[PDB]
């Protein structure tokens, strides 16, 4: 087994309660070291209307030793949260965010309808229409380089076949659930047993 | 919605300048922002535009090393900086908002600012 | 660059009912990248249409533009008492967003 304990709680608590979250191609990552996991807040509370483990089982059987907890969170629109499984394909996950066909983790999404809405809609929160090439797992472009579609130069001003790279979800208040933004915490984990820096809650060793 | 900018300069050639376009609330999320150079008695020149959010500010071949765009995320306030006042740089300054996103593809200049002219004095 | 003309140079001596104002350019404007602004003197230009016709917020639908390509008309059904203005082109395809002359300036 061979995990230390850390009388240090893991600031999950942190990641899935803050007020701001991250636009999905900024997305914004947090590492969990060194302290005790919490797991089953996540599986208990059940609000979270997404909590999909890939290869750790959502069942209560994460209570497992993790060597690097990353923890990513990014609001995107409610038809997309399907997009960000390993091995799928679209626009969010070829040019925003890319999970690896490995992803030895959990999404885990919920509704922010009331929170990440605001009335005339909110434009806070931005995605990558078009981009040159797909976009490889864990990587982050924060470039608004004018997006090429065309053999006319771009000359960094946009029009005819040249695009503004990024655009505006605008989610409103009154709008179909399709269309409504969900907060996403991926968590990345890397299972090993042996470092174990983010320590389990079970009985040492 | 409403613009309101500066209104004349009583700069003395080779002095410096900088505008003051206002922004209402809402304008710089979703709006670049354009200046359009009008020379007394000429056409419409574009200068350029700037992008408030991610800061990016393109300016035309022939204002490049010129002129400076600069515009406060905080207050929402557009900012135009002219180097130096060159004899042939009298002119009214206008500041208009154009949508850079790709689904709106309008990039055209919705509204405008009441004019900032610049002159050797007055 | 694509630069653009305006043909009728000065329309502002009164003319009545239809006016085919013009606007032609080196490379064919592309998408109908085209917009008419109306120059009030004493005021800055105003949008008066966008596209190749779609019309503006608060415009009466008696402006329309004709545009093929480029967008070479203009056309007020009538020329009432206000619209006595100094009407722009511009275009938006990839250049420095080049403006025309002017129509109807005395």
């Known amino acids: 087994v061979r995990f230390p304990n850390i009388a240090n709680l893991c600031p999950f608590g942190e990641v899935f309660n803050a007020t701001r979250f991250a636009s999905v191609y900024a997305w914004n990552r947090k590492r969990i070291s060194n302290c005790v996991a919490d797991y089953s807040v996540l599986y208990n509370s059940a609000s979270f209307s997404t909590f999909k483990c890939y290869g750790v089982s959502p069942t209560k059987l994460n209570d497992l030793c993790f060597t690097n907890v990353y923890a990513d969170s990014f609001v995107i629109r409610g038809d997309e949260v399907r997009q960000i499984a390993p091995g799928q394909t679209g626009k969010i996950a070829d040019y925003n965010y890319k999970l690896p066909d490995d992803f030895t983790g959990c999404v885990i999404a919920w509704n922010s309808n009331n929170l990440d809405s605001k009335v005339g809609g909110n434009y806070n929160y931005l995605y990558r229409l078009f981009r040159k090439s797909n976009l490889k797992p864990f990587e982050r472009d924060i470039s608004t380089e004018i997006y090429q579609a065309g053999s006319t130069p771009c000359n960094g001003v946009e029009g005819f076949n040249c695009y503004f790279p990024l655009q505006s979800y605008g989610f409103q208040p009154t709008n179909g659930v399709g269309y409504q933004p969900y907060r996403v915490v991926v968590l990345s984990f890397e299972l090993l047993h042996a470092p174990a820096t983010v320590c389990g809650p079970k009985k040492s060793t | 919605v409403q613009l309101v900018q500066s209104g004349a300069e009583v700069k003395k050639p080779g002095s410096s300048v900088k505008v003051s376009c206002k922004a209402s609330?809402?304008?710089?999320?979703?709006?670049?922002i354009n200046w359009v150079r009008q020379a007394p008695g000429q056409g419409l020149e574009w200068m350029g535009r700037?992008?408030?959010?991610?800061?990016?500010?393109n300016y035309a071949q022939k204002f490049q090393g010129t002129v400076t765009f600069t515009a406060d995320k905080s207050t929402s306030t557009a900012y135009m900086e002219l180097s130096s006042l060159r004899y042939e740089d009298t002119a009214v300054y206008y500041c208009?908002?154009?949508?850079?996103?790709?689904?709106?593809?309008?990039?055209?200049?919705?509204?405008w600012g009441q004019g900032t002219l610049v002159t050797v004095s007055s | 660059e694509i630069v653009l003309t305006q043909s009728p140079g000065t329309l502002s001596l009164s003319p009545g009912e239809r006016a085919t104002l013009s606007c032609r350019a080196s490379?064919?404007?592309?998408?109908?990248?085209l917009a008419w602004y109306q120059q009030k003197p004493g005021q800055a230009p105003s949008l008066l249409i966008y596209?190749?016709?779609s019309r503006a917020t608060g415009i009466p639908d008696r402006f329309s533009g004709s545009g093929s390509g480029t967008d070479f008309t203009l056309t007020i059904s009538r020329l009432e008492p206000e619209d006595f203005a100094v009407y722009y082109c511009?275009?938006?395809?990839?250049?420095?967003?080049?403006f025309g002359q002017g129509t109807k300036l005395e």
């Open positions: 596209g190749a016709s």
């Open positions: 700037i992008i408030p959010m991610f800061g990016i500010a």
């Open positions: 609330g809402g304008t710089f999320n979703t709006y670049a």
């Open positions: 208009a908002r154009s949508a850079y996103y790709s689904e709106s593809s309008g990039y055209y200049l919705d509204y």
């Open positions: 490379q064919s404007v592309s998408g109908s990248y």
């Open positions: 511009q275009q938006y395809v990839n250049s420095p967003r080049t």
